[PDB]
Write a protein that binds this ligand. Structure first.
Ligand SMILES: COc1ccccc1C(=O)CCc1ccccc1C(=O)O
Ligand SMILES: [Zn+2]
Ligand SMILES: [Zn+2]
Ligand SMILES: [Zn+2]
Ligand SMILES: [Zn+2]
Length: 182
């Protein structure tokens, strides 16, 4: 299940409570959640919201991708993923079974739980979503994680600019370090 990164107790919303230690954290990347006015991070722009600071491969972000784009990341890396239901209506047990509609090609899960499954594979294989980023996404990631505003250099054509952004991001900003890897 999910372990409190603080106490280590084992168990579509990312905000998780551990009742033992009262830690607030993200169930996708295990980074801490902060209530409004409680965030200590100097370069964070969100000071009046309940939030955490997530790596680019947290489900917090990747849940907003389409299933098709999540599949594309897996396909580009030749990681297999299920599309068909199991041998014998979403079975995933939620805290209120999920019971939602089970679309064709979504492996017998609802849309949200199928994306969670794809992200679980993406994370297991340490696939980097930045490899599919358009330049706008690379610029956003640069601002978010490197705290600088990117801009192309004189003499840099568009492919070179995009490649530079991608190279600096991947070299200097690790994927989530508390996300479980295989
Ligand atoms: C799926 O749930 C959400 C998705 C996007 C934004 C907000 C929510 C929620 O209100 C529930 C989950 C949640 C609660 C508090 C803080 C963050 C989140 C979250 O998952 O983003
Ligand atoms: Zn705990
Ligand atoms: Zn997260
Ligand atoms: Zn913050
Ligand atoms: Zn479901």
């Amino acid at each position: 299940g999910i372990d409190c990164p603080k106490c280590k107790f084992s168990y579509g919303c990312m905000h998780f409570h551990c009742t033992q230690c009262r830690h607030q954290f993200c169930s996708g990347c295990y980074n801490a959640f902060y209530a409004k006015n409680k965030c200590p991070e100097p370069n964070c722009r969100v000071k009046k919201s309940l939030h955490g600071h997530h790596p680019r491969d947290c489900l917090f972000y990747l849940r907003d991708w389409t299933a098709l784009r999540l599949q594309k990341l897996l396909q580009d890396n030749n990681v297999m993923f299920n599309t068909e239901p199991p041998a014998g209506g979403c079975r995933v047990i939620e805290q209120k079974a999920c019971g939602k509609e089970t679309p064709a090609g979504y492996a017998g899960l609802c849309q949200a739980h199928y994306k969670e499954y794809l992200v679980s594979l993406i994370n297991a294989h340490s696939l980097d979503p930045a490899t599919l980023y358009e330049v706008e996404e690379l610029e956003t990631a640069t601002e978010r994680y490197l705290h600088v505003r990117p801009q192309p250099l004189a003499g840099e054509d568009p492919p070179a600019y995009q490649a530079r952004l991608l190279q600096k991001l991947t070299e200097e900003v690790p994927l989530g370090q508390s996300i479980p890897r295989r």
